[PDB]
Paper text:
Similar to the CARD8-CT filament structure, no UPA density was observed in the NLRP1-CT cryo-EM map, suggesting that the UPA subdomain, with the 25-residue predicted unstructured linker to the CARD, is also flexibly connected to the core NLRP1CARD filament. The NLRP1CARD filament has one-start helical symmetry, with a left-handed rotation of 100.8° and an axial rise of 5.1 Å per subunit (~3.6 subunits per helical turn), similar to other CARD filament structures. Strikingly however, unlike any other CARD filament structures known to date, the NLRP1CARD filament is composed of NLRP1CARD dimers, rather than monomers, which is also reflected in the thicker dimensions of NLRP1-CT filaments compared to CARD8-CT filaments in both 2D classes and the 3D volume. The total diameter of the NLRP1CARD filament is approximately 140 Å, with an inner hole of ~10 Å.
In general, inflammasomes leverage supramolecular filamentous structures to nucleate the polymerization of caspase-1, which in turn increases the local concentration of its caspase domain to facilitate dimerization and activation. Here, we determined the cryo-electron microscopy (cryo-EM) structures of NLRP1-CT and CARD8-CT filaments and analysed their assembly and specificity.
Numbering used by the authors:
A (entry chain L), B (entry chain K), C (entry chain M), D (entry chain I), E (entry chain O), F (entry chain P), ...: 1379 to 1463
Amino acid sequence: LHFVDQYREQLIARVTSVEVVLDKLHGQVLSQEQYERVLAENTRPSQMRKLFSLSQSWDRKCKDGLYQALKETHPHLIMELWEKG
Amino acid sequence: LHFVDQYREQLIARVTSVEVVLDKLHGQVLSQEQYERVLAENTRPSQMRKLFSLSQSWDRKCKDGLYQALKETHPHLIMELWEKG
Amino acid sequence: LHFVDQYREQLIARVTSVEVVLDKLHGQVLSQEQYERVLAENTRPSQMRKLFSLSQSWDRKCKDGLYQALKETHPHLIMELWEKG
Amino acid sequence: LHFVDQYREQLIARVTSVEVVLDKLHGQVLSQEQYERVLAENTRPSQMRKLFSLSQSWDRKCKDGLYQALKETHPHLIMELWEKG
Amino acid sequence: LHFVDQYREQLIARVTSVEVVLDKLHGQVLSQEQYERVLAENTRPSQMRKLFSLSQSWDRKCKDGLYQALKETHPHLIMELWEKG
Amino acid sequence: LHFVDQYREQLIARVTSVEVVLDKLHGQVLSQEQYERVLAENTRPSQMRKLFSLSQSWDRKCKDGLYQALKETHPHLIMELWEKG
Amino acid sequence: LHFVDQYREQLIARVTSVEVVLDKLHGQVLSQEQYERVLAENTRPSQMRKLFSLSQSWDRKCKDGLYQALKETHPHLIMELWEKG
Amino acid sequence: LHFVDQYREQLIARVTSVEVVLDKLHGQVLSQEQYERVLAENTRPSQMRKLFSLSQSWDRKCKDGLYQALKETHPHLIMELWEKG
Amino acid sequence: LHFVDQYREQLIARVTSVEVVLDKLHGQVLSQEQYERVLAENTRPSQMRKLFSLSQSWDRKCKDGLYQALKETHPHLIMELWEKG
Amino acid sequence: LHFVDQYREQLIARVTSVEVVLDKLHGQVLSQEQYERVLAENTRPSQMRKLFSLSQSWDRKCKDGLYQALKETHPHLIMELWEKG
Amino acid sequence: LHFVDQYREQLIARVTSVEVVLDKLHGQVLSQEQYERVLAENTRPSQMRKLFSLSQSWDRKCKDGLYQALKETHPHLIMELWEKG
Amino acid sequence: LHFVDQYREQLIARVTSVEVVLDKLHGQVLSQEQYERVLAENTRPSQMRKLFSLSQSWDRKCKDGLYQALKETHPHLIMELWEKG
Amino acid sequence: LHFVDQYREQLIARVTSVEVVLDKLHGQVLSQEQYERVLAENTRPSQMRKLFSLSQSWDRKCKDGLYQALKETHPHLIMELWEKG
Amino acid sequence: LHFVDQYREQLIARVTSVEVVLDKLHGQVLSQEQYERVLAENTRPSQMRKLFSLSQSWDRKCKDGLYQALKETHPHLIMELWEKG
Amino acid sequence: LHFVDQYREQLIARVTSVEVVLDKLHGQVLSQEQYERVLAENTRPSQMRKLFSLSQSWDRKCKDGLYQALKETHPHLIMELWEKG
Amino acid sequence: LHFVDQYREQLIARVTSVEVVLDKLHGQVLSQEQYERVLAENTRPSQMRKLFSLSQSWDRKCKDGLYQALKETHPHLIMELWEKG
Amino acid sequence: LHFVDQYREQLIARVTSVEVVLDKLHGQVLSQEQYERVLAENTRPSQMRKLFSLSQSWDRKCKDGLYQALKETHPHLIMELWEKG
Amino acid sequence: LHFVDQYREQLIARVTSVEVVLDKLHGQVLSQEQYERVLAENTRPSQMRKLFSLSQSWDRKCKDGLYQALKETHPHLIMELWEKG
Amino acid sequence: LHFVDQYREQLIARVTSVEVVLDKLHGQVLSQEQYERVLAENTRPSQMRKLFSLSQSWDRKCKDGLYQALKETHPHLIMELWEKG
Amino acid sequence: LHFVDQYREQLIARVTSVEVVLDKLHGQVLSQEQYERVLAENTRPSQMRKLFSLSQSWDRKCKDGLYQALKETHPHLIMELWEKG
């Protein structure tokens, strides 16, 4: 199990600034079409859910990329998750 | 339950000088992008509401930071809330 | 039949300041996700409609909570509805 | 039909000193949040338009209140409207 | 074919002050809900497009009303369209 | 033959503000589940088509209810249909 | 008989925020494919119905998991069901 | 068209002693708040511009009042404008 | 209801020497930033209005402070208000 | 209407020895700060105008005080005004 | 083979401002219902894909119309495609 | 291409006294509402940008009017632009 | 890879004066509708993001145009990016 | 971290003579448009905040320039900040 | 708290010979521009208020300098303040 | 770069007799409205700053005119600037 | 069958303002002599009856004209008739 | 059933200020003799009872009049009754 | 219907100073003989009644003249009538 | 078909100021001899008829010239014709 898959629900619920993470991911991991498609969702939890629906293909490296993106944007949330573990 | 979550509605309604609290929070707790995004709202209640929409990620420590910021700016409001409790 | 269900259409049409009622309801009755989801709608009638789509689960107590929220925000509208009854 | 609804466009276009009418209305008819929200608009016609968007809830009594506020501030405009009728 | 349907694209592109036309139309032709819904769009072309999406129901009389509203607000644009014809 | 069945295609094509009619119908004629199900359609013509697929059960009284709802929302369209008759 | 099987119809009808419950269930009880498949349904009652069609395999433990998920999301609905019992 | 609206730009540019005209207008046509607000502008052209922004409400009678005020203060300017006509 | 909230409009309209009241309030009740911000307004009624927009946070004690400040500066106005009561 | 408000313009224009009236008013009606502030104006009409801008707060008693001050200083002007009445 | 069919994938991927092209096409080539249906899609690539799903009926003339619409909106993209050829 | 459209950016950047040009344009080309709306912008470049956003409707004649207004106010800037051409 | 695509995230985050770049781009590269649409976004990062969503169509030449626009407005940022490379 | 970013809040709060620093910065670091835009703010803290919103692009060299500007204008404030460090 | 901040209002009200204190402060504490700017105010209380608006930057040493300047110019006022303490 | 743009800050700071330069410039380079507007500023540095804000339009010839005006009024300052160069 | 012939009796009985319809019809459909002759009848039903006696000659176009005239004058009656149909 | 007849007992018991309601009703609904006769009762409940004994004749309009009178005098009681309903 | 014909009875009853209105009307609308004849009546209501008996001939223009005369003489009565409308 | 040829009869009948249009046309389109010859006619319709008899030679460009001349002289007539179209 990964970190992102462990607290999948937690990330979906409590991640707020999703646009920044997407922009961090865009190009390196997220195709333009996938990026816009996930961006097209209305609510932030919905955006996260679509992101996670698009995470199936990703290898361990890409999950690491997303983790890097999240650690940068929301260090506190990441701390909360590690504490929960 | 926290103090900020307890009187969420009260803070949203009756907090006025929001820019100062944001500047207090900026850097320590609020990213530049989140700070500007919350600042971009027109009305003060709207600014507070966006701030609270951005508060999901925050850990207990960050809620404490915000409490410190509010106690400094509006001691009287804080007193009113404690009395209500 | 309730009061909110009686004049469902009337509330949807003629309620304007919906954000305040939501903030009153948030936490006590409305989950963060449901609150944001209903807030994500563009027009006020649309926001009300989503709110009413989310009202199915609510017990009599929660309908009472919403009634309290509306009576506080729009006493005049509430008076109009009672007169119609 | 009311007087305010009859010449809705006329009031939106030709009412200038809107702040005074709002202050007259504030408390009695306009909540603090609604008052600030309508005040937050840039142009006077925009302020009027927001005011009219917030007028849906108002009962006949509140429309009368607004009429009183306008008759006091702009007697001449009121005369023009009656003549048009 | 009408005038509004003839230069549908032209009106969508080159009409700027749309709020005034809406206020002219509101009540007589546009319901409060339709009026707000069309107003809820961000860009002026988008507002026009929504207006035209709402124009399907309108009879010849209502298209005439809209034409009157546009001729008043933008006489020059109307002249350009007639010249194009 | 009814009025709604006569110009079934016309109503499906040229009715735009469908949400309002549904809200008018909801409770009195449309069950919550049927209401949401018809609302779940993407395009307005699709919403109308689903509404008409759900109209089979309706008695003359319910068709009258729908007619009332449409006459209120789109008087002009109703006029066009009567003229066509 | 279980609680979920007792008020199967009630849960199908009156559960609204289904996405959250699914996210709570995903991983622990719901496979990714089953989760997406149930999510692919249009209406919330349809989503619930598919969820219940997928509940056949579940052991008592998994029904308990779902109950936990529902009690968290919709405490009021759960109360209504117990009262009905 | 009026005289004041005809040479609106001319009056804005070439009227100098604006305070006297305001004092002539104050009470009869200009509310205390409007009077001070127009007086609060720095430059004379700015004062005139604000005055003209406040002239929308005025009826023909009030435009006549302003004309009287200007004819008294600046007979020469009035002569220049009539000659231009 | 307070005294300041009772005659909110009256204070906004008829208070003139606002700078002195602010200086009386500065430090004890008004932060430096709030003080300057309210001072930055052009007209005295505007200054009062901003002051009242900043009065939301204030507790009963602070409203009393403002009352003290006003009673000192404008005893006559205070008398007029009490008589009105 | 008062006497001072009736011939406001007349007093502003034709009162010359303003310092004496101020000294008569100082203490009883005019605060030291208001007195100096009105005195700080350059021209006599400007001094009068500032005095009248400061007259909003004054009760009937204070307007009477000012009238007494003017009757003493300029009996002839007072006679002219009564004749005009 | 046509130009639009040649670079079907390219147009679907890299066309951005799709609304304008639709408005250009609406009436001449696209029925109101087809226009709205293609507009109802969320993402721009999805809108293009629906447009291409609706392009089966179109004759060479209509494909030419679409080409004209695209050449006007995105000359650069058209250049890229010709270069690829 | 016009002159105003040619050096659109140049006019936006280097035009300073915008109020005068607006007053020149007001009535003949700019509606009262459009005039105030463009005036409501804070910075001069912003005012110009709004003016240019409102220039879409204008016919060649109105662009000529604006050119006349600019040539009068800023002959030097006009010379610079012609030299650039 | 281009320069703009390389530091896409960096440009989105750290570009501030976006209006000027747009005005530089408008006409040559950005259509009026695209220009207004990107301008309609609230925050500067959002404006940049929309700009980048609209950059898909652009050929190498247009990316060069944007680079020119950015180098002119923010030479320092451009230097930072080259150093990062 | 820089010095300006360290005490961002402190500089925003306690810097007073901002115009001089801007004039020092104008040309070398601040574009004319950015300079005017930051100058357009009402209050000094607001001016500083806008300045800091415009500081994102700036390289280390430009932050040094601003530091030089501040050290010259307010040596004492700079001393206070170093002591705090 | 300092002495100057303690009796801020008292100093603003009752300090008269302000020019001398400024000249004492000029060079050592007050920049030429700040000195002239504070001198540019009309009334002495206004001059003091501007001085205090410029006192934010000052360190304890500079507040001491101002205290020295005041003790020299108005020993009696200083005595009154100490007695009040 | 020009001479006036080179030492923009120096001219703003150290130019004192600004009225004379304006009178020299008035008519030839400065419109009456611009002249009064720049004159309306309180402090000399502020007057210079407004003058420089109005200098954007000026061609090389007008900058030369201003240079002539300054060389005549303040030869010594001009010498200091050349030495600095 | 036509609409006027269908509800001939209904129109004869329940049409009241007949003069207006005649004036609408006069010239286009009704000769001067026929118009006066139908007008010469005493009672409104008699006028209608004579009108219908004069309707024999009328073609479908003229019956349409009369329908237009009636729809304009008595929309409600027209609605009643359509409902009866 | 009416509102007054529904809570007849409640109104009889809990209405206190009866004289005011009578004065409101006198003339419009209550004859002088009936008014005095109901007033002649000793206790307030007795007065109400006599009022209700005199309410038999009243039409729906008069019951509405009484409701208006009560809503004005005792809004709180009216709220209690609606809640009971 | 006109305004004078609407409240014919009201004008007859509540108009008092009738001679002034007649003098205003005499010459323009009222012949010398008609003027004296209406003046010959004893009571003011009788004078009004005769005036109204003489109003049959008057065209819309003359009814407007009378309205002007009444609005000037009795603005309050005119206000009462408009409110009644 | 052209515009002038479409409403040939309308222009002949309803154009009044023909001399001005001729003067506009003279030189550019109308030879001196043709101009005088058309001018030699007595009545305005006759002048128009001769003008139209002389219009046979004119190319599309010259018909455009005449249209320009007419639009300038009689904008209202041109509007009437477009409406007729």
